[PDB]
Amino acid sequence: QGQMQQSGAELVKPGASVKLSCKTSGFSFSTSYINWLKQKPGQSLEWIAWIYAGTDGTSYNQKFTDKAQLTVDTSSSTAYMQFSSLTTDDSAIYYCAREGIYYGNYAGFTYWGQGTLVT
Amino acid sequence: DIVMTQSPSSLAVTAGEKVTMRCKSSQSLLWSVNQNNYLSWYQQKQGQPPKLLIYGASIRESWVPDRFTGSGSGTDFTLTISNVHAEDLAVYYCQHNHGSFLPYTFGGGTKLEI
Amino acid sequence: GVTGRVEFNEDGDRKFANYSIMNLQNRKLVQVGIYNGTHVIPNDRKIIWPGGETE
């Protein structure tokens, strides 16, 4: 079974940058899609961006297009999200999830990380 | 963003009864060329990642028992449980999967109580 | 080699490279065929054209 492990909790000064890591294993890292979601405590998750590892195709939320950047490392099969210009609004829990696709048809997020809290 | 309307917001029933949860999209999730509805039902329990329950608004997952029944098409959709069990207690979300209708959005959610 | 038969030409390049074929189906990369070192084999998936029919 696939596993996605995220980085630990971070205390970042306002206006500074954080770069979160998400190690993936147990599946084809190159031929899947990974999504970063922002979930404030007591709030629903906010989709940030998705990236395809096989083609480096990147697509960000308009609210986070100028705030978040995504990178991947094929050797380690680890996803990366670098959040810059951090503000108190960014005090939330970020999650990385792997898309579940059946018969070539997306069927929802089937795999999840443990979650990371950025203060 | 397509507005996903879920009804009811929450409900409480006794074990063995039958319940019905509705999902309404602001736009038709049916693509005319293939006549398939880009709707997916999910089961989300506390402290766990959500589990894909029904896709295409009518097809149950392999692990989903026959008691679950998803219906509706176009803009309006329905999730129905013929025989409600205590284990089914969870918050169920319907989410669109239409690639041409990005970004993916979720409804308000329905909380199941026993 | 995991890739397979590694062999060089008079230009020192690679021979018999297997290729993957992707179709942009509703802004999603769906595999529609495979390429051997000399032959193309479409997979079970369908391919949709910019217009109507798949033909």
Write a brief caption for the model.
Chain A has 119 residues and is an all-beta fold. Chain A has no helices and ten strands. Chain B is globular, with a radius of gyration of 13 Å.
Features:
part of a larger assembly, 3 chains, A: 119 residues, mainly beta, six-stranded antiparallel beta sheet, four-stranded antiparallel beta sheet, globular, C: 55 residues, 29% strand
Task: Give a verbal description of the structure.
Chain C: This is Glutamate receptor ionotropic, NMDA 1. Chain C: Glycans are attached at residues 18, 36. Chain C: Belongs to the glutamate-gated ion channel (TC 1.A.10.1) family. NR1/GRIN1 subfamily. Chain C: It is found in: Cell membrane; Postsynaptic cell membrane; Postsynaptic density membrane; Synaptic cell membrane. The structure is cut from a larger assembly and holds chains A (119 residues), B (114 residues) and C (55 residues). With 119 residues, chain A is mainly beta. Chain A is built from no helices and 10 strands. Chain A has strands at 3-6, 18-25, 33-39, 45-52, 58-60, 68-73, 78-83, 92-102, 105-112, 116-118. In chain A, the strands form 2 sheets. In chain A, strands 3, 4, 5, 8, 9 and 10 form a 6-stranded antiparallel β-sheet that branches. A 4-stranded antiparallel β-sheet of chain A has the order 1-2-7-6, with no helix packed on it. In chain A, a hairpin with a 5-residue loop joins strand 3 and strand 4 (45-52). Chain B has 114 residues and is mainly beta. Helices cover 0% and strands 46% of the residues of chain B. The N and C termini of chain B lie far apart (33 Å). Chain B contains no helices and 12 strands. In chain B, the strands form 3 sheets. Chain B has a 6-stranded mixed β-sheet, with no helix packed on it. Chain B is globular. Chain C has 55 residues and is mainly beta. Chain C has a 3-stranded antiparallel β-sheet with strand order 1-2-3, with no helix packed on it. The radius of gyration of chain C is 15 Å and the shape is elongated. Chains in contact: A-B, A-C, B-C. Chain A binds chain B through residues 44, 47, 61, 97, 100, 102, 105-112, and chain B through 40, 42, 49-50, 52, 55, 95, 97, 99, 103-104, 106.
